[PDB]
Design a protein around this ligand. Structure first.
Ligand SMILES: [Br-]
Ligand SMILES: [Cl-]
Ligand SMILES: [Cl-]
Ligand SMILES: [Cl-]
Ligand SMILES: [Cl-]
Ligand SMILES: [Cl-]
Lengths: 330, 40
């Protein structure tokens, strides 16, 4: 369909993967790279942690709106993949304009990282994870409402799970974040990796650690109203649920709950997918039951204080009813 | 865990089923049928 070129390392060679990583970094910041090239470079970056990235992408690409031509790269000459033409020349223009474009800046806060030669496996891994971690973190601040920072990156640093040396500039991360916002395919494929990692089955411990952290944060955040509603609105089994006014909200949440059962792990990651389903499970679709649930939760659970605040859908009469029902059942 | 959440969903479904089938009996239990009604 919309073909996408994906460059992938053909070997575990630290030096090949590091130059290949840098090139992908450069495509994304490049002015004369088609959005299709940039999408491919995201795949390259996102999959670089794996033993065999090309095989990772093929086994997990579930996406009809795109055709991936995965291209094996056995070696780099002058920072660009070697191909087994003008096509060579094009990949040079991508580097040159990426470089000339910015004020001598690199994708890295410490420019030294950009000129660095890596040949040790543990330094590659560390650099690759550190770069990937920063990309996944973009996914994290996307799912949140902008009603909240750096505690993320700082946590990984004190934990030494990330290497501050390979920190990307804001300008580069903004390029990446743009790409994520505009490209359903990259997000879709990231969703595949989140599902794949949960499963899981890989020995890339440090990578799947950081991907799990995000994945789990995306789940907790997007399904938080849903499950609070079930836990505090339904599970408490208050007879006030039989009031006529709750009946449509009961239908809705029954449909959503059946949904969750047949979709499976994909369901919590809907918040990252097509616009029209991102809010599938959002409590604003069953707001009276939600408000009732809020009223129970803030009454009986000391960890639920956040729910005293109206984020837009709070229905005061139903919130009060929750408080009253919770106070009535001891 | 994912298991605990699956049990939440299936218990959520059984609760809604019980309500929808006994909604009137429970309303005698609860004292009223509409939230706009005085409770007692
Ligand atoms: Br709200
Ligand atoms: Cl792997
Ligand atoms: Cl940049
Ligand atoms: Cl790893
Ligand atoms: Cl009604
Ligand atoms: Cl009650």
């Amino acid at each position: 369909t919309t073909k996408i070129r994906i460059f992938v390392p053909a070997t575990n060679s630290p030096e090949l993967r590091w130059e290949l990583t840098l090139f992908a970094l450069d495509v994304i910041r490049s002015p004369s790279a088609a959005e299709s090239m940039k999408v491919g470079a995201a795949f390259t970056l996102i999959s670089m942690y794996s033993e065999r990235p090309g095989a990772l992408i093929r086994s997990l690409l579930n996406d009809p709106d795109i055709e991936a031509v995965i291209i094996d790269v056995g070696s780099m000459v002058n920072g660009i993949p070697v191909m087994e033409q003008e096509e060579m020349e094009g990949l040079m223009r991508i580097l040159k304009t990426a470089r000339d474009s910015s004020k001598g800046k690199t994708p890295f806060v410490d420019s030294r990282a950009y000129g660095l030669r890596i040949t040790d496996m543990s330094t590659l891994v560390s650099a690759v994870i550190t770069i990937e971690a920063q990309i996944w973190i973009l996914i994290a601040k996307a799912v949140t409402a902008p009603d909240t920072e750096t505690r993320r990156w700082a946590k990984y640093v004190q934990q030494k799970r990330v290497n501050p040396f390979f920190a990307l500039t804001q300008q580069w991360l903004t390029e990446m974040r743009n790409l994520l916002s505009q490209s359903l395919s990259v997000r879709k494929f990231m969703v595949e990796i989140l599902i794949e990692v949960k499963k899981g089955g890989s020995a890339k411990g440090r990578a799947v650690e950081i991907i799990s952290d995000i994945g789990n944060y995306v789940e907790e955040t997007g399904m938080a109203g849903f499950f609070a509603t079930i836990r505090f609105g339904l599970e408490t089994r208050y007879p006030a649920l039989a009031l006529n006014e709750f009946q449509s909200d009961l239908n809705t949440i029954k449909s959503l709950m059946l949904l969750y059962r047949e979709i499976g792990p994909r369901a919590p990651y809907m918040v990252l997918l097509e616009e029209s389903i991102q809010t599938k499970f959002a409590p604003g679709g069953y707001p009276l039951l939600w408000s009732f649930a809020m009223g129970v939760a803030t009454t009986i659970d000391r960890s639920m204080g956040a729910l005293n605040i109206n984020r837009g859908y709070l229905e005061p009469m139903y919130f009060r009813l929750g408080q009253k029902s919770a106070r009535h059942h001891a | 865990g994912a298991m605990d959440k699956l049990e939440l969903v299936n218990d959520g479904l059984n609760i809604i089923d019980f309500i929808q089938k006994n909604q009137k009996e429970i309303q005698k239990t609860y004292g009223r049928s509409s939230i706009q009604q005085p409770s007692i």
